[PDB]
Amino acid sequence: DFDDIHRKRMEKDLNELQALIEAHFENRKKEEEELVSLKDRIERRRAERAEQQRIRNEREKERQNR
């Protein structure tokens, strides 16, 4: 007894810390930069949609104005 405390504690004392650091690094890398880039891409597409909407609205208002 009291000799399995080493073999159940020291293991996770380093392996768990290193593995969680690895998980945090990979999750941040996968998540944050890709999300910001994708949001910028969607913003550009949204601006293009806004331009198309403005053009169509203006041309239809020009024709229909009677």
Partner: protein, 56 residues
């Protein structure tokens, strides 16, 4: 005459509604992107912290 008056009227309502919808859509999307970018800035704060934690 009744039919086409109805159709044009409800169509005009539709156009005004859909344009309001588009303004709503753009505002929501841009706000979402701003919030997501704030979150990713926080994530990179945490990632700098994790690089410090690389001390372990």
């Amino acid at each position: 005459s009744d039919k086409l008056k109805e159709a044009e009227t409800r169509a005009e309502f539709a156009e005004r509604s859909v344009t309001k919808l588009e303004k709503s859509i753009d505002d929501l999307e841009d706000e979402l992107y701003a919030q997501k970018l704030k979150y990713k800035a926080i994530s990179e704060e945490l990632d700098h912290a994790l690089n410090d934690m690389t001390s372990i």
